[PDB]
Amino acid sequence: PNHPLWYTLCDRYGLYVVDEANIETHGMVPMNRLTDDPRWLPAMSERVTRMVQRDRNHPSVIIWSLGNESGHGANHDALYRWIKSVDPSRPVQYEGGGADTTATDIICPMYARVDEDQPFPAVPKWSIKKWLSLPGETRPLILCEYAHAMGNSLGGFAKYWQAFRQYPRLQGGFVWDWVDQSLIKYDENGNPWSAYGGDFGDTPNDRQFCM
Amino acid sequence: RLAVMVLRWSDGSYLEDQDMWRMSGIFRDVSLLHKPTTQISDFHVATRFNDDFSRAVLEAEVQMCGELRDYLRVTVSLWQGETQVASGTAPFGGEIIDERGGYADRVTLRLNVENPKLWSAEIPNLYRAVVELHTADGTLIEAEACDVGFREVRIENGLLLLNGKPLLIRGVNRHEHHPLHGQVMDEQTMVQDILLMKQNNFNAVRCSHY
Ligand SMILES: [Mg+2]
Ligand code: NA
Numbered sequence: 001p002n003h004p005l006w007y008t009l010c011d012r013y014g015l016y017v018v019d020e021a022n023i024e025t026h027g028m029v030p031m032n033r034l035t036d037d038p039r040w041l042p043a044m045s046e047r048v049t050r051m052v053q054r055d056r057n058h059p060s061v062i063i064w065s066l067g068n069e070s071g072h073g074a075n076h077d078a079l080y081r082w083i084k085s086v087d088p089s090r091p092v093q094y095e096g097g098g099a100d101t102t103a104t105d106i107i108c109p110m111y112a113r114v115d116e117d118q119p120f121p122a123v124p125k126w127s128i129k130k131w132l133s134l135p136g137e138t139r140p141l142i143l144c145e146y147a148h149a150m151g152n153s154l155g156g157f158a159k160y161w162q163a164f165r166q167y168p169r170l171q172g173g174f175v176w177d178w179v180d181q182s183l184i185k186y187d188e189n190g191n192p193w194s195a196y197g198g199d200f201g202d203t204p205n206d207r208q209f210c211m
Numbered sequence: 212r213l214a215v216m217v218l219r220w221s222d223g224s225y226l227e228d229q230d231m232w233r234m235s236g237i238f239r240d241v242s243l244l245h246k247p248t249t250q251i252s253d254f255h256v257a258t259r260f261n262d263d264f265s266r267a268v269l270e271a272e273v274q275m276c277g278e279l280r281d282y283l284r285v286t287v288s289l290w291q292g293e294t295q296v297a298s299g300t301a302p303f304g305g306e307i308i309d310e311r312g313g314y315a316d317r318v319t320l321r322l323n324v325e326n327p328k329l330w331s332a333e334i335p336n337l338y339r340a341v342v343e344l345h346t347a348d349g350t351l352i353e354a355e356a357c358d359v360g361f362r363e364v365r366i367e368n369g370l371l372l373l374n375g376k377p378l379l380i381r382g383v384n385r386h387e388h389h390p391l392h393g394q395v396m397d398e399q400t401m402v403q404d405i406l407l408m409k410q411n412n413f414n415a416v417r418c419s420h421y
């Protein structure tokens with residue numbers, strides 16, 4: 001959840017917002033180790049319920065998200081249903097565990113390609129066109145993350161938009177991402193320079209991946 | 212002496228506007244068939260399966276025409292080669308279907324088949340079903356027969372399934388056409404077509420359009 005002013009500005013200027021619980025357990029092995037564990041349900045529940053209690057009156061918020069990259073655990077299903085009960089006015093989405101689980105109203109993959117399948121075990125990233133028409137699948141597809149804009153990038157951006165315009169149920173996506181997370185450091189003359197992972201003696205680090 | 216007056220055009224032509232040569236005549240077989248007065252007038256064969264296709268029930272509905280009699284029987288027997296695999300015998304008289312009763316002139320036979328050999332384009336396993344109309348005592352009146360392929364066709368979750376597996380149709384539309392004989396079909400040409408189709412990785416044909 002963002003600084004509270006953010007939603008007021010989105011209300012007034014007019015932007016659709018996905019409000020997302022502060023829950024990410026990406027580094028767990030497997031990714032759902034905590035989110036499938038009932039002992040972590042109380043902690044997760046508060047991150048979801050208190051966001052809804054804070055932000056539910058903002059019209060800019062159109063979709064609730066259960067968090068990010070935390071696999072798919074029984075705790076997600078429980079909190080999915082909690083939101084659906086207390087606030088029927090907004091769909092709930094969640095990408096973890098393969099982007100089309102029972103804890104999501106929207107197929108919301110990250111970095112699924114337009115035409116090319118990436119058939120990873122357990123959590124495949126289907127071509128978005130193919131994904132829509134998988135046997136029994138009926139939900140809209142909106143990429144929670146796509147077109148990773150790291151450095152000289154956004155190659156093939158037009159391919160997404162052609163697909164979005166052609167397929168009614170491809171309803172767009174959220175580019176990753178808005179702003180480089182570089183930090184300012186200063187040389188011996190006080191001249192500023194943009195720093196990334198590792199430039200602060202931080203180790204292990206993931207170098208320029210913050211930008 | 213038979214006299215047949217064949218018209219090229221009729222009100223039927225309005226329903227026969229296929230993209231093909233417009234021809235006319237007696238272009239398929241003519242035959243004489245002798246049936247007994249008490250006869251098999253219709254029969255339907257169905258095959259239903261359990262979830263893993265390790266068990267089947269062949270269901271055969273048989274209809275008769277002629278005089279209804281207590282001594283009449285139908286036997287449906289199922290054959291794989293010279294081996295009889297299942298048999299069922301019953302007198303006529305279907306189950307009650309409404310307030311006025313049932314079909315006295317019908318009977319449904321149900322034959323259990325364990326581990327049926329399944330029919331597909333890949334392996335066209337066939338059984339022979341023989342439908343005997345006969346007396347209780349076993350005097351034959353007449354027999355009809357057909358080839359039986361144990362297969363289930365169904366659409367589930369948006370997939371066309373054959374025997375529980377999603378088909379991939381390598382199909383072709385085929386008209387009945389011969390460059391010399393027009394729209395008259397012969398066994399030799401039909402067989403030539405089927406061999407060529409299968410040799411070229413086709414598994415399906417649409418009877419375009421009749
Ligand atoms: Mg036409
Ligand atoms: Na669309």
Ligand code: NA
Pocket residue numbers: 209210211
């Ligand atoms: Na990053």
